Amino acid sequence: TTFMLKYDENGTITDAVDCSQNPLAELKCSVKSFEIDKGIYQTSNFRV
Amino acid sequence: IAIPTNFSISITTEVMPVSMAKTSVDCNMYICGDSTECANLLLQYGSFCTQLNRALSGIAVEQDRNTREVFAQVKQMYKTPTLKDFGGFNFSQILPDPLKPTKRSFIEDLLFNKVTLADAGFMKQYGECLGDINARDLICAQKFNGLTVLPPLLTDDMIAAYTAALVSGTATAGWTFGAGAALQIPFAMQMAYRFNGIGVTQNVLYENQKQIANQFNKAISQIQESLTTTSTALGKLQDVVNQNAQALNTLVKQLSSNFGAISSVLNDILSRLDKVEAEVQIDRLITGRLQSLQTYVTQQLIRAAEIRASANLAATKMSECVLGQSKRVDFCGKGYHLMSFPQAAPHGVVFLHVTYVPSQERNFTTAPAICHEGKAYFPREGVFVFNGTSWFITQRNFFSPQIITTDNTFVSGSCDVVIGIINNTVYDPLQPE
Amino acid sequence: NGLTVLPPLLTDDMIAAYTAALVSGTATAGWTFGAGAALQIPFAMQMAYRFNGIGVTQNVLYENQKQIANQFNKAISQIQESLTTTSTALGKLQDVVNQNAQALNTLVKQLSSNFGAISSVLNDILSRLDKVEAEVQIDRLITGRLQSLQTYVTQQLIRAAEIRASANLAATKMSECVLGQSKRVDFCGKGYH
Amino acid sequence: IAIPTNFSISITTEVMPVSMAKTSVDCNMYICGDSTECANLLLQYGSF
Amino acid sequence: LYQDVNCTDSWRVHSTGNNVFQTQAGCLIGAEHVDTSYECDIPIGAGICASYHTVSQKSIVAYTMSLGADSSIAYSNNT
Ligand SMILES: *[C@@H]1O[C@H](CO[C@@H]2O[C@@H](C)[C@@H](O)[C@@H](O)[C@@H]2O)[C@@H](O[C@@H]2O[C@H](CO)[C@@H](O[C@@H]3O[C@H](CO)[C@@H](O)[C@H](O)[C@@H]3O)[C@H](O)[C@H]2NC(C)=O)[C@H](O)[C@H]1NC(C)=O
Ligand SMILES: *[C@@H]1O[C@H](CO[C@@H]2O[C@@H](C)[C@@H](O)[C@@H](O)[C@@H]2O)[C@@H](O[C@@H]2O[C@H](CO)[C@@H](O[C@@H]3O[C@H](CO)[C@@H](O)[C@H](O)[C@@H]3O)[C@H](O)[C@H]2NC(C)=O)[C@H](O)[C@H]1NC(C)=O
Ligand SMILES: *[C@@H]1O[C@H](CO[C@@H]2O[C@@H](C)[C@@H](O)[C@@H](O)[C@@H]2O)[C@@H](O[C@@H]2O[C@H](CO)[C@@H](O[C@@H]3O[C@H](CO)[C@@H](O)[C@H](O)[C@@H]3O)[C@H](O)[C@H]2NC(C)=O)[C@H](O)[C@H]1NC(C)=O
Ligand SMILES: *[C@@H]1O[C@H](CO)[C@@H](O[C@@H]2O[C@H](CO)[C@@H](O[C@@H]3O[C@H](CO)[C@@H](O)[C@H](O)[C@@H]3O)[C@H](O)[C@H]2NC(C)=O)[C@H](O)[C@H]1NC(C)=O
Ligand SMILES: *[C@@H]1O[C@H](CO[C@@H]2O[C@@H](C)[C@@H](O)[C@@H](O)[C@@H]2O)[C@@H](O[C@@H]2O[C@H](CO)[C@@H](O)[C@H](O)[C@H]2NC(C)=O)[C@H](O)[C@H]1NC(C)=O
Ligand SMILES: *[C@@H]1O[C@H](CO[C@@H]2O[C@@H](C)[C@@H](O)[C@@H](O)[C@@H]2O)[C@@H](O[C@@H]2O[C@H](CO)[C@@H](O)[C@H](O)[C@H]2NC(C)=O)[C@H](O)[C@H]1NC(C)=O
Ligand SMILES: *[C@@H]1O[C@H](CO)[C@@H](O)[C@H](O)[C@H]1NC(C)=O
Ligand SMILES: *[C@@H]1O[C@H](CO)[C@@H](O)[C@H](O)[C@H]1NC(C)=O
Distance, in Å, from the CA atom of D8 to the CA atom of B3, rounded to the nearest integer, reads 32
Q: Are residues E5 and A41 in contact, defined by beta-carbon separation less than 8 angstroms? A: no
| E-interface mutation test, from A37, A38, A47, most E Cβ less than 10 A away | A38
- The 3-state DSSP composition of chain D as helix, strand, coil percent (nearest 5) reads 35, 10, 60
Give the nearest ligand 2 atom to C64 CA: 49
Find chain D residues with C-beta within 8 A of C2's C-beta. 25-30
Angle between helices B275-317 and B235-253 (to 10 degrees): 170
Beta strands in B200-302 (DSSP E): none
Q: Which of E3, E68, E78 sits opposite B76 (nearest CB)?
A: E68
> Measured in angstroms, how far is the CA atom of residue C43 from the centroid of ligand 2?
21
Q: Are residues B158 and E37 in contact, defined by beta-carbon separation less than 8 angstroms? A: no
Distance, in Å, from the CA atom of C136 to the CA atom of A40, rounded to the nearest integer, reads 46
Q: Do chains B and E touch (3 or more CB pairs under 8 A)?
A: yes
| Chain B from 8 to 67: CB within 8 A of any E CB | 64
E44: closest chain A residue by CA: A40
Query: H or E element: which one contains B35?
Result: none
Q: Are residues B343 and C19 in contact, defined by beta-carbon separation less than 8 angstroms? A: no
**Encoded amino acid at B255, one letter:** L
Task: Determine phi and psi for B378, rounding to 5 degrees.
Answer: -125, 155
- Does residue B28 have its Cβ closer than 6 Å to ligand 1? no
Residue D36 CB partners (closer than 8 Å, separation 6+):
none
**Cβ D46–B260 below 8 Å, yes or no?**
no
Q: Are residues B224 and B233 in contact, defined by beta-carbon separation less than 8 angstroms? A: no
Beta strands in D1-48 (DSSP E): 22-25
> Measured in angstroms, how far is the CA atom of residue C180 from the centroid of ligand 2?
29
Task: Determine the distance in angstroms separating the CA of B71 from the nearest CA of chain E, rounded to an integer.
Answer: 11
C179: closest chain B residue by CA: B329
> Measured in angstroms, how far is the CA atom of residue B387 from the centroid of ligand 7?
6
Distance, in Å, from the CA atom of C71 to the CA atom of C68, rounded to the nearest integer, reads 5
CA dihedral E2, B153, A44, B272 (to 10 degrees): 100
Q: Are residues C111 and C152 in contact, defined by beta-carbon separation less than 8 angstroms? A: no
Distance, in Å, from the CA atom of C158 to the CA atom of B298, rounded to the nearest integer, reads 10
Task: Determine the distance in angstroms separating the CA of D47 from the nearest CA of chain B, rounded to an integer.
Answer: 8
> Measured in angstroms, how far is the CA atom of residue B368 from the centroid of ligand 8?
15
Sign of torsion over alpha carbons E34, E36, E38, E44: positive
Q: Which of B83, B148, B182 sits opposite E73 (nearest CB)?
A: B182
Find chain E residues with C-beta within 8 A of A48's C-beta. 12
Q: Which of E5, E14, E50 sits opposite A23 (nearest CB)?
A: E14
Find chain E residues with C-beta within 8 A of B187's C-beta. 75, 77
Q: B43 in helix, strand or coil?
A: helix
Find chain A residues with C-beta within 8 A of B34's C-beta. 47
B260: closest chain C residue by CA: C139
Distance, in Å, from the CA atom of B81 to the CA atom of C153, rounded to the nearest integer, reads 53
Say which experimental method was used: cryo-EM
Find chain B residues with C-beta within 8 A of A23's C-beta. none
Task: Determine phi and psi for E17, rounding to 5 degrees.
Answer: -65, -50
Q: C186 in helix, strand or coil?
A: coil
User: Which among B127, B87, B16, B27 is positioned nearest to B350, based on CA atoms?
Assistant: B16
Task: Determine phi and psi for D25, rounding to 5 degrees.
Answer: -125, 130
Task: Determine phi and psi for B284, rounding to 5 degrees.
Answer: -60, -45
Q: Are residues B73 and B318 in contact, defined by beta-carbon separation less than 8 angstroms? A: yes
- Does residue C66 have its Cβ closer than 6 Å to ligand 2? yes
Q: Do chains C and E touch (3 or more CB pairs under 8 A)?
A: no
Q: Do chains A and E touch (3 or more CB pairs under 8 A)?
A: yes
What are the angstrom distances between the C-alpha of B339 and each of B322, B333, C123, D14?
Answer: 6, 9, 68, 32
Question: How remote is the C-alpha of C14 from its chain's centroid?
Answer: 16
Which 8-state DSSP code applies to residue C85? S
